[PDB]
Predict the structure.
Amino acid sequence: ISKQLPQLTSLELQYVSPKLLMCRDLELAVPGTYDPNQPIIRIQSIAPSLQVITSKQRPRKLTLMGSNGHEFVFLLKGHEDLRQDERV
Amino acid sequence: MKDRMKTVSVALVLCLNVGVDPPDVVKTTPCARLECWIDPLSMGPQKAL
Ligand SMILES: [Mg+2]
């Protein structure tokens, strides 16, 4: 395994999450935004593949397309308690 | 068929070096470079070979 993780790269959703690859217009809002005083952008779709960043840890660079066509970029990652960050 | 000469062995000479673009060629965005229906330029050279 240690001799294959360095060769790790961008991953396609077909092989890790067929359900998300088939995901289309939901009732959900874009995760990072909710304004009750303004219209809510609905999740339109997600990218076919994610990009793996290389370090001691390996976050994943997710792209997401909203109902307005705007693209939003996020870092997916584990081993973390982000509640402290929300409070800060 | 008095001639019965059969083939016995096969040599697979894969001279291609993954990720190296010779000066002879200038590619374009739709240069799908599938070989054996398998295009892991993403995975890096060793997995590809
Ligand atoms: Mg994360």
Summary: Chain A has two helices and five strands. Residues A 59, 75-78, 80 surround magnesium ion (CB under 6 Å). The first strand of chain A starts at residue 11 and ends at 12.
